[PDB]
Design a protein around this ligand. Structure first.
Ligand SMILES: NC(=O)c1ccc[n+]([C@@H]2O[C@H](COP(=O)([O-])OP(=O)(O)OC[C@H]3O[C@@H](n4cnc5c(N)ncnc54)[C@H](O)[C@@H]3O)[C@@H](O)[C@H]2O)c1
Ligand SMILES: NC(=O)c1ccc[n+]([C@@H]2O[C@H](COP(=O)([O-])OP(=O)(O)OC[C@H]3O[C@@H](n4cnc5c(N)ncnc54)[C@H](O)[C@@H]3O)[C@@H](O)[C@H]2O)c1
Ligand SMILES: CC(=O)N[C@H]1[C@@H](OP(=O)(O)OP(=O)(O)OC[C@H]2O[C@@H](n3ccc(=O)[nH]c3=O)[C@H](O)[C@@H]2O)O[C@H](CO)[C@@H](O)[C@@H]1O
Ligand SMILES: CC(=O)N[C@H]1[C@@H](OP(=O)(O)OP(=O)(O)OC[C@H]2O[C@@H](n3ccc(=O)[nH]c3=O)[C@H](O)[C@@H]2O)O[C@H](CO)[C@@H](O)[C@@H]1O
Ligand SMILES: [Cl-]
Ligand SMILES: [Cl-]
Ligand SMILES: [Cl-]
Ligand SMILES: [Mg+2]
Lengths: 345, 345
């Protein structure tokens, strides 16, 4: 059978997706440059070594950079792909503002190179990791797919928006292409085994991992970025979605490609928003630990609330997020507890 | 630190700007890969060989691709540039629609690589070839710099907008950068000698070379892309600007950089729009020939009408386009007539 190329597959979302692909019967080939994934010293990134263990199925892997055209060329010659799921990229907002060129290079040039090879090799079937960030500051809520996109505030968000645009143009230009752009909301949680999850290096920029790190006792308290927002409790409201649900949405997307769907765009969110305080309360509950916090200044670029209108995905992808708040917290806690320092032995 | 690097210097706008540079006392270094240029009889592309003749000055040139990192690196090690004028890229609205990836690769990836090399060598002064296409479908006329940018109608325009955006980000991250973004309107005309001008390969994509070719009898007739636009005669309205005036605008831009201007954006237009039909008329008058045209469908990617508000350039660059319609046609005609087959065969 033909394979499924998974770029950046050793990462957070990708590893979970590889697991789901294997469980669903697909044959994945992962490529990763270890920019944000732990090695271990063996042939696989630790995340994938564990996915193999958990599923009892092999993960084919090639260490490589999407910026390496020559390596991409050889890869497409070595394997017969039927689709590509593209997670590879840089995603640190703060870092993007500081080093815009790095983001444009990895994100834009890398994606362009990958699209050229796919075109060249006749693998015109893509699933792309996009983000609700492309919508910019919400003009209305919930955010549906027709909400305006662009006018992003940082280089990171801009790069995702530009990528979306490039893919739209490609599909318009060649009707034989099929591409599903998935706008993730706030991915959280980990596989139920507690053996894989998000492995942030240093201080996590996202709320959840910070909260769990406070709970585990690695951090003293949570700094809450403002409490004067226009929300019920004044703290920011987001659509947290279980990474496992998110991963399953990728399989639904592959199925969509098989229907020769052309260019499709879907939000991958729950449609339910929770505030920072509500997330802390739930994590207290899942962890059985106290989670102290302190209200600090607002974070530059943050908005009051951001949550999805997941109807389209349900309708067309037949996908809906299954796991709730408690499950997300329980699963995150399990991973955190079982792996206090993330990956290694 | 004396030289000025000119990418795509063998092309239409580039060759003319090389000439103005020489005459203004600058020391240009030109690089071109001949995608849309004519390899002379020697090393130099024919255009530059002629430029040398006209100016009595020498042109340093190096054949290379902005896509070649290695070559760029060497180049920047070889010379000490005080600034860069970046003309290299793909430039047709309609063709972009059918070939988005080529535009994205050459324009975006080419520009990013260029910017990385510049930054890495402390060459932080730039003159960029932007376009009125970044304004997308005009919301009002004439177009001032503050008119919204983005929401482009074609990949070419999207590519230019994205580049503008990246540059703005770069300048933010590094205050020491000086970058002048020139939104050219429709370049036309030719050097007064008739020795150089636009030398399109195959069927001309743009209005004037096609019109002129009909006149010299190289084309049977002109195809007019739609007559149902919201314009006086229903045909496309554009701000045609003489290539010589554009070139002079570039010297003014180089001067602007001396003020440690940072990020600046200026329209380079005349402020006068002309219809497709009006252009034909003017060329009929200039060539005294018969110019037959067939009305056809609207072309994907084209806007109805667009012309510049050139106040800002006037005020800040101390620049205005002098050359009028008759002059542009006479100049275009002279070049066409003296060079019926372009720079050679
Ligand atoms: N995590 C989120 O909250 C979030 C939200 C929306 C969208 N996204 C997007 O989803 C994707 C996956 O996000 P994630 O949370 O799993 O991040 P991640 O960093 O864990 O995974 C990305 C993977 O890409 C690899 N990579 C980076 N640059 C590479 C390159 N040049 N070549 C090859 N591999 C390279 C990294 O080493 C890493 O394993 C990213 O594109 C991200 O921008 C994530
Ligand atoms: N031409 C217009 O009507 C217009 C108006 C707005 C913006 N611009 C821009 O100004 C620039 C020059 O326009 P022009 O009319 O002179 O076009 P042109 O095609 O004559 O000039 C572009 C030049 O770049 C060279 N080139 C292309 N790809 C290259 C690569 N990868 N490496 C090196 N050289 C390469 C081509 O060979 C050519 O000599 C382009 O960026 C164009 O988009 C022009
Ligand atoms: C500016 C920024 O980072 N935007 C990113 C962030 O948005 P986003 O704000 O949605 O997600 P975060 O995880 O960073 O924050 C969620 C909420 O928690 C708050 N919070 C967060 C961390 C913390 O220590 N304290 C605290 O109070 C934030 O203000 C917000 O209200 O995550 C999305 C998912 O990765 C990305 O696509 C966005 O690009
Ligand atoms: C190839 C070229 O130089 N394109 C330039 C032109 O774009 P632009 O697309 O406006 O230029 P064109 O010469 O292709 O089009 C001008 C007008 O002429 C019409 N037309 C054109 C050709 C033809 O055979 N028949 C016909 O009717 C078009 O529909 C349009 O209304 O100016 C822009 C700035 O404004 C530049 O950024 C572009 O680089
Ligand atoms: Cl294979
Ligand atoms: Cl940078
Ligand atoms: Cl293409
Ligand atoms: Mg409003």
């Amino acid at each position: 059978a033909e394979k499924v190329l998974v770029t950046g597959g050793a990462g957070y979302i990708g590893s979970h997706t590889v697991l789901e692909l294997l469980e669903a019967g697909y044959l994945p080939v992962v490529i990763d440059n270890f920019h944000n994934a732990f090695r271990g010293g063996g042939s696989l990134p630790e995340s994938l070594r564990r996915v193999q263990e958990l599923t009892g199925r092999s993960v084919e892997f090639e260490e490589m950079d999407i910026l390496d055209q020559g390596a991409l060329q050889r890869l497409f010659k070595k394997y017969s792909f039927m689709a590509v799921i593209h997670f590879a990229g840089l995603k640190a907002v703060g870092e993007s503002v500081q080093k815009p060129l790095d983001y444009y290079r990895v994100n834009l040039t890398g994606t362009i190179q990958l699209l050229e090879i796919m075109k060249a090799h006749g693998v015109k079937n893509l699933v792309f990791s996009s983000s609700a960030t492309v919508y910019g500051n919400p003009q209305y809520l919930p955010l549906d797919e027709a909400h305006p996109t662009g006018g992003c505030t940082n280089p990171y968000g801009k790069s995702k928006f530009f990528i979306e645009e490039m893919i739209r143009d490609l599909c318009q230009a060649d009707k034989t292409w099929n591409v599903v752009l998935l706008r993730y909301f706030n991915p959280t949680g980990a596989h139920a085994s507690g053996c894989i999850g998000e492995d942030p290096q240093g201080i996590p920029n996202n709320l959840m991992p910070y909260v769990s790190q406070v709970a585990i006792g690695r951090r003293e308290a949570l700094n809450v970025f403002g409490n004067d927002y226009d929300t019920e409790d004044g703290t920011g409201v987001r659509d947290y979605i279980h990474v496992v649900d998110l991963a399953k949405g990728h399989i639904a997307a592959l199925r969509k490609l098989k229907e020769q769907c052309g260019c499709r765009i879907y939000n991958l969110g729950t449609g339910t928003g929770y505030s920072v305080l509500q997330m802390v309360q739930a994590m207290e509950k899942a962890s059985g630990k106290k989670i102290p916090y302190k209200v600090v200044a607002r974070r530059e670029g943050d908005v009051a609330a951001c949550y999805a209108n997941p109807s389209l995905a349900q309708e067309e992808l037949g996908w809906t997020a299954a796991l709730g708040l408690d499950r997300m917290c329980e699963d995150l806690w399990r991973w955190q507890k079982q792996n206090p320092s993330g990956f290694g032995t």
